[PDB]
Coordinates of all heavy atoms in Angstrom, one line a residue:
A38 N -20.0 3.0 3.4 CA -18.6 3.3 3.5 C -17.9 3.2 2.2 O -18.4 2.5 1.3 CB -17.9 2.2 4.5
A39 N -16.8 3.8 2.0 CA -15.9 3.6 0.9 C -15.7 2.1 1.0 O -15.5 1.6 2.1 CB -14.7 4.3 1.0
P40 N -15.7 1.4 -0.1 CA -15.3 -0.1 0.0 C -13.8 -0.3 0.4 O -13.0 0.6 0.2 CB -15.5 -0.6 -1.5 CG -16.6 0.4 -2.0 CD -16.0 1.7 -1.5
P41 N -13.4 -1.4 0.9 CA -12.0 -1.5 1.4 C -11.1 -1.3 0.2 O -11.4 -1.8 -0.9 CB -11.9 -3.0 1.9 CG -13.4 -3.4 2.2 CD -14.2 -2.7 1.2
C42 N -10.0 -0.6 0.3 CA -8.9 -0.5 -0.7 C -7.9 -1.5 -0.4 O -7.4 -1.7 0.8 CB -8.4 0.9 -0.6 SG -6.9 1.1 -1.6
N43 N -7.6 -2.4 -1.4 CA -6.6 -3.4 -1.1 C -5.2 -3.0 -0.9 O -4.5 -3.6 0.0 CB -6.7 -4.6 -2.2 CG -8.1 -5.4 -2.1 OD1 -8.9 -5.2 -1.2 ND2 -8.3 -6.3 -3.1
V44 N -4.8 -1.9 -1.5 CA -3.5 -1.3 -1.2 C -3.4 -0.8 0.2 O -2.4 -1.1 0.9 CB -3.2 -0.1 -2.3 CG1 -1.9 0.4 -2.0 CG2 -3.5 -0.6 -3.8
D45 N -4.4 -0.1 0.6 CA -4.6 0.4 1.9 C -4.6 -0.8 3.0 O -3.9 -0.7 4.0 CB -5.9 1.1 2.1 CG -6.0 1.8 3.5 OD1 -5.1 2.3 4.1 OD2 -7.2 1.9 4.0
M46 N -5.2 -1.9 2.6 CA -5.3 -3.0 3.6 C -4.1 -3.9 3.7 O -3.8 -4.3 4.8 CB -6.6 -3.8 3.3 CG -7.9 -3.1 3.5 SD -8.0 -2.7 5.4 CE -7.6 -0.8 5.3
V47 N -3.5 -4.3 2.6 CA -2.3 -5.0 2.6 C -1.2 -4.1 3.2 O -0.3 -4.6 3.9 CB -1.9 -5.4 1.2 CG1 -0.4 -5.8 1.2 CG2 -2.7 -6.5 0.7
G48 N -1.3 -2.8 3.0 CA -0.4 -1.8 3.5 C -0.5 -1.8 5.1 O 0.5 -1.6 5.8
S49 N -1.7 -2.0 5.5 CA -1.9 -1.8 7.0 C -1.3 -3.0 7.7 O -1.2 -3.0 9.0 CB -3.4 -1.7 7.4 OG -4.1 -2.9 7.1
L50 N -0.8 -4.0 7.0 CA -0.1 -5.1 7.5 C 1.4 -4.9 7.5 O 2.2 -5.7 8.0 CB -0.4 -6.4 6.6 CG -1.8 -7.0 6.7 CD1 -2.0 -8.2 5.7 CD2 -2.2 -7.4 8.1
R51 N 1.9 -3.9 6.7 CA 3.4 -3.7 6.7 C 3.8 -2.4 7.5 O 5.0 -2.3 7.9 CB 3.7 -3.5 5.2 CG 3.1 -4.6 4.3 CD 4.1 -5.3 3.4 NE 4.3 -4.4 2.2 CZ 5.3 -4.6 1.3 NH1 6.2 -5.5 1.5 NH2 5.4 -3.8 0.2
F52 N 2.9 -1.4 7.5 CA 3.2 -0.1 8.1 C 2.2 0.1 9.3 O 1.1 0.4 9.2 CB 3.1 1.0 7.1 CG 4.0 0.7 5.8 CD1 3.6 0.0 4.8 CD2 5.3 1.2 5.8 CE1 4.3 -0.3 3.7 CE2 6.1 1.0 4.7 CZ 5.6 0.2 3.6

Side-chain angles (χ1 to χ4, degrees):
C42 167
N43 291 351
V44 183
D45 185 35
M46 292 295 104
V47 163
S49 66
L50 294 173
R51 316 228 275 165
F52 305 86

